[PDB]
């Protein structure tokens, strides 16, 4: 059981989440895909595996006004659980995802892969890989 929580500006992370979802469904696993704006730590608690979807913003950062408020709320129950990280970038890779990995790992949770894409999904099999991994917790 996987809660795929995504923040999508320009369709990108939605389509990424959809790709992941298909790989989860292929291995007969229950998926709950929602947006960062409409979720809660209590919901997350019921799912052994969680995936977070945030594109690269400003100067190689996470999306401050939604993802960081939800992350702080999430932190008390982000222990032991399998958390996969998925994001789209334009011109700069890695940094935002490294900082993101560091904070998600740091709460006592483990990272069930990191998917980085050049704007649009499919261009990185990583998305599908994360799907498979999430299906298998
Ligand atoms: C205000 C703003 C700021 C950034 C971006 C876009 C926008 C609109 N993008 C590109 C972005 O990661 C890419 O286009 C995503 O596929 C879509 O991101 P959003 O859904 O538009 O936030 C971007 N890309 C990148 O590689 N490093 C960066 O720091 C940023 N910063």
From Swiss-Prot:
Required cofactor names: FMN
Domain of life assignment: Bacteria
Pfam families, alphabetized: Flavodoxin_1 (PF00258)
InterPro entries, per database record: Flav_short, Flavodoxin/NO_synth, Flavodoxin_CS, Flavoprotein-like_sf, NADH_oxidoreductase_modular
Entry keywords, A to Z: Electron transport, Flavoprotein, FMN, Transport
Role this protein plays: Low-potential electron donor to a number of redox enzymes.
Family label: Belongs to the flavodoxin family.
Protein name per its UniProtKB record: Flavodoxin
């Amino acid at each position: 059981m996987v809660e795929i929580v995504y923040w999508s500006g320009t369709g990108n992370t939605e389509a990424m989440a959809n790709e992941i979802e298909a790989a989860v469904k292929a291995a007969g696993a229950d998926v709950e895909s929602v947006r960062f704006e409409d979720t809660n730590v209590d919901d997350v608690a019921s799912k052994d595996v969680i995936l977070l979807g945030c594109p690269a913003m400003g100067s190689e950062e996470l999306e401050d006004s939604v993802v960081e408020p939800f992350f702080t709320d999430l932190a008390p129950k982000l222990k032991g659980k399998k958390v996969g990280l998925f994001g789209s970038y334009g011109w700069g890779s890695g940094e935002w995802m490294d900082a993101w990995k560091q904070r998600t790992e740091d709460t006592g949770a483990t990272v069930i892969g990191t998917a980085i894409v050049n704007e649009m999904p499919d261009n990185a099999p990583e998305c599908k890989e994360l799907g498979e991994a999430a299906a298998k917790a």
